[PDB]
Amino acid sequence: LYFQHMAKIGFIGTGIMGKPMAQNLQKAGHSLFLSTHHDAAPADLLEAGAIALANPKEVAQEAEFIIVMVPDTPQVEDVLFRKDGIAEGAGPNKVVIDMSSISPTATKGFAEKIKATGAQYLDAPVSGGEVGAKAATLSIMVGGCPNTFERALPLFQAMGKNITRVGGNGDGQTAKVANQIIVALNIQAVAEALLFAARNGADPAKVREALMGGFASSRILEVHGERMVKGTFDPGFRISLHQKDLNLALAGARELNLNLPNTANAQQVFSTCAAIGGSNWDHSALIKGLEHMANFSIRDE
Amino acid sequence: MAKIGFIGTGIMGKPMAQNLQKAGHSLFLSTHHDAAPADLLEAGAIALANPKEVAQEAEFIIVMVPDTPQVEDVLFRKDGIAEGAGPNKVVIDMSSISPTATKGFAEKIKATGAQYLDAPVSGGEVGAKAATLSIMVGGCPNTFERALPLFQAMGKNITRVGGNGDGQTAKVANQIIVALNIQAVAEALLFAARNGADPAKVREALMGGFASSRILEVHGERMVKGTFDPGFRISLHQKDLNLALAGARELNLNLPNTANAQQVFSTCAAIGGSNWDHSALIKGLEHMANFSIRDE
Amino acid sequence: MAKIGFIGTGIMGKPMAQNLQKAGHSLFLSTHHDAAPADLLEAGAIALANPKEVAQEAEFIIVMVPDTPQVEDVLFRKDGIAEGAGPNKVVIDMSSISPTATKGFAEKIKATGAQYLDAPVSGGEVGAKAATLSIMVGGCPNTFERALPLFQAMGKNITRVGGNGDGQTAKVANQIIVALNIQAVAEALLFAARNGADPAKVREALMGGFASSRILEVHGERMVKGTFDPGFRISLHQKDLNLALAGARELNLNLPNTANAQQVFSTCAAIGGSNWDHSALIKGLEHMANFSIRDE
Amino acid sequence: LYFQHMAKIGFIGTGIMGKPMAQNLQKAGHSLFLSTHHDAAPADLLEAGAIALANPKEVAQEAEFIIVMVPDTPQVEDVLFRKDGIAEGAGPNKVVIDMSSISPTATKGFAEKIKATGAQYLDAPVSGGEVGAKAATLSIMVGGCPNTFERALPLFQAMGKNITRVGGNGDGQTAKVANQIIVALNIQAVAEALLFAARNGADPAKVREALMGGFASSRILEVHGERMVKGTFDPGFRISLHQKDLNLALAGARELNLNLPNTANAQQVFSTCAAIGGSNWDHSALIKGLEHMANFSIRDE
């Protein structure tokens, strides 16, 4: 309830997701604090009043909330615990919110190390992509203390639509890995289906249009399915990043004794995509690896 | 408007036939296989001896039986649909059968003067009752336009994919997505529960994002709640996946997820689950991990 | 000793029949399908019009044709083996066909007074020529003992697995191992070559250890040297894997490696390889990695 | 040729493989030097004249050749580069021979760091198991300088039968990963086949006996195949260790863009084995996970 008042929020990682999320936080009337350590602060954010400090430590000192939107597990560790990082600037009454898609197992240790400074920790990765981040319609899956979650909820509301506390620390990251298994497999599912249909001489565009509103309907079918048919593979979410995400699921499966045959196989098909020069294609281009495997394309190009 | 015949008034047939009556259509049932549903009789449907006498009377004849042999038999056996079909009549196969055989059945039906549409559906018993099924159709555009108002009374998203066989192909493609989407939710929820997270909260958390699907909404809820009473039985989906895998072998396709999904349904069948709803694919993966996402 | 009939003197049949002559057996060929190999004729083999006249003359009738329908036809068609078979005659199916259908064919052959053994082989064209084939047999122990000296002339490791059908089951199991062992060597060599290591040296290095196999020795050498001219064609092994995958679906078995191997052979077929020797499964995996273990 | 003269060889890691290999080196007339840092020297080796020093550094100082037989990649790094490790005791005219089954990619870096001390490096992992180690019939696949290889060849001859220089540093480890892909997949192959045969009512013992001498013949069929039928799963090579090995193949596949569907799937089936309490069963017990998946056992117990 309280954060209808201005909030002091630091934002570490202003990428294709971080920049629109920080922009949306500023539109809800909040004060943004940036780190210029790796990259210069975007002029869009400086114009809206963001204070560009020199490093994550200084950011953690000025701000009450510190959001991290970086690519992977080792980068969160470095940003949190390197010299002049978030832990050195954190203490009581401060909330460190990792919105990156990292290891759930590692997150538990990061949460303990941050809480050892008197600060609180939330793991709140998102779903919805760049389009979702700009629209503030992201699904935010949170892991942490229920009072910390409620305290940070008005901020999550400015960045997303469905916000949910899955459980304690590590759970928000476990919810993002589960998301990542679904996303990658729903893509593989639509690709195999359209490849089968087009191989039998059925127009894949008509097939995808016909499946909407039934048991095969999904956001992947309407979004990725259209990209597969139209060949619009310009990265939204790179195959190299989804391979990083599936590695978390498969590492978890190895440690916790899970037999996930389709998650294991989507990782192999993503490698066919990379082998034909596709690490930086959007993950919808997973169809191109299946087309390579079939010696048949669903497109006329 | 229109007199309609209906062979196969089962779990999907009866509610689809019921919605045709409400729309102002006269129905003609066949009591050769079994007795006509009293609900339909009490509402105006005429019972007839066989699909030939039904075809003779009706201008539109819908078929809804379990597999390719059963469609073949009801179309071309003695006293079947073809014998009573002819000029101006339209045969509509709304069953989910082999796209390959459909082109042959359509050819033989057209040889009587009649027309043929292959219009399988998606949306389960629920969607048939509520008339929100997605109906994928293959056949002549003029023939599709004639049957379109009947399709509108049975479903919501109606679409002509292409010529004859293309409707059945869209259905195989649908069954690949249904099985693989069910396995994605099962693998994802088993990963979550195994990590100590609540699968009920994870399912709720993923709504509105890229992981959003009709499967996460319906079948995902069944996985969390343990509600596996058949809507669509595993033994039936295994038959649907065989159509895809036979077609992939014939057309030189490498579909590894679909192939894995067939092997997983086999584990479900081995542990006593041939008649569970296809959402119980999670039970096969759960067995594979010696760990269930639910209690007791 | 013994008069022997031989239907199917092809790539495997002709050398097996040849070795029976050398052992002191009189052969009876059928010229219904095609002309008798001149090599066999010049060595004493009598040509006859059909498998019935061959069965009438011989006490042992060996069959070696490509699949289940072809065995069914040659056994039970007009002028086939059954018509001329009877008391004291023994039908030996050395083809690799469905274990399921074999029990039915055996039952129908016994109904003539004759006996039946299902004795498929392993060891390729090479092993047939050199008489070192491993012969897996199903049937009556007394019937197996009668045919044993003939088996000894055609192969080296002779074994009765069980009753009728068990020989064919051992062959399906053999084909699962052959395909999966070929894919293990292909995946292993592709991993090695991809890491900049010489696949020729890696194959040599692995001999004598736990990775030692007949496949690493024969098929591994073909993968390194690029010698993919058929011994056993991919389209044939795909049919063999379908027997295993149909049986797994029927018996509620989850065989994920075998299922993956079938999907990989499909990539080989898509890139023009239906007639390559099964060692060219590496070519499918190589295509899947955009990287070949050989040059040019 | 020269090492028909006594050699000074250090042995770091005296496990189920290390102890018989060190014993066989001593029977060829060589001097063994042990480290008592983690474990006490086995009395079998001390009786044959092994000098038990205090740590890998001291061992590298006294011996000309230093063999390492430890479980995995991080343990080789620790043994080679920790305080009082092999690198601190190494210099010119010294050969460090890693016989462990570790990452080929990491090995290249370990080789460079060791060569920076004036010492030479060989990566010579083996195949043949405990039975092979005792019999000195192991297949030794070596990676390194051809002169270093020839110099160390009489020592490899006392420990094994087929010794081969695959290539330069990293290649011996790449040859062991290729070995590990074959071993795990040949086991999965025999298990699926015997499970299929037994499911159809054919005696699996007769089936395995029938397949020998044909295209399905292998060491896995004669060795592991008999264990599958007889249920003798007492560890020779633990499933947990083969899962470590397949992780190297799958990590390599992810980095180098390989689609290896059966290596990926054997890793999932090994997890079913672990899930039912099998991390310490012999890898032949991979059949038990397939039996769990089929709800059917090939045995009467």
Numbering used by the authors:
A (entry chain A), D (entry chain A): -4 to 296
B (entry chain B), C (entry chain B): 1 to 296
Text of the article:
We also show that the purified proteins encoded by PA1502 and PA1500 have glyoxylate carboligase (Gcl) and tartronate semialdehyde (TSA) reductase (GlxR) activity, respectively, in vitro. Gcl condenses two molecules of glyoxylate to yield TSA, which is then reduced by GlxR to yield d-glycerate. GlxR displayed much greater specificity (kcat/KM) for Gcl-derived TSA than it did for the TSA tautomer, hydroxypyruvate. P. aeruginosa GlxR was a tetramer in solution, whereas Hyi formed a dimer.
Both conformers contain an N-terminal domain comprised of nine α-helices surrounding a core of nine β-strands, and an exclusively α-helical C-terminal domain. By contrast, the oligomeric arrangement of the β form tetramer adopts a more open, expanded structure. However, when we superimposed the individual α and β protomers, they had a very similar structure, indicating that the differences in quaternary structure are primarily due to rigid body rearrangements of the protomers. Interestingly, and although the α conformer is more ‘compact’ than the β conformer, the distance between the serine –OH and the lysine –NH3+ was larger in GlxRα (5.3 Å) than it was in GlxRβ (4.6 Å). Given that the GlxRβ tetramer is also structurally more similar (cf. the GlxRα tetramer) to the GarRSty tetramer, these data suggest that the GlxRβ conformer is likely to be more physiologically relevant. By contrast, the GlxRβ conformer – at both the protomer and tetramer level of organization – was a better fit than GlxRα with the X-ray crystal structure of a GlxR homologue, GarRSty.
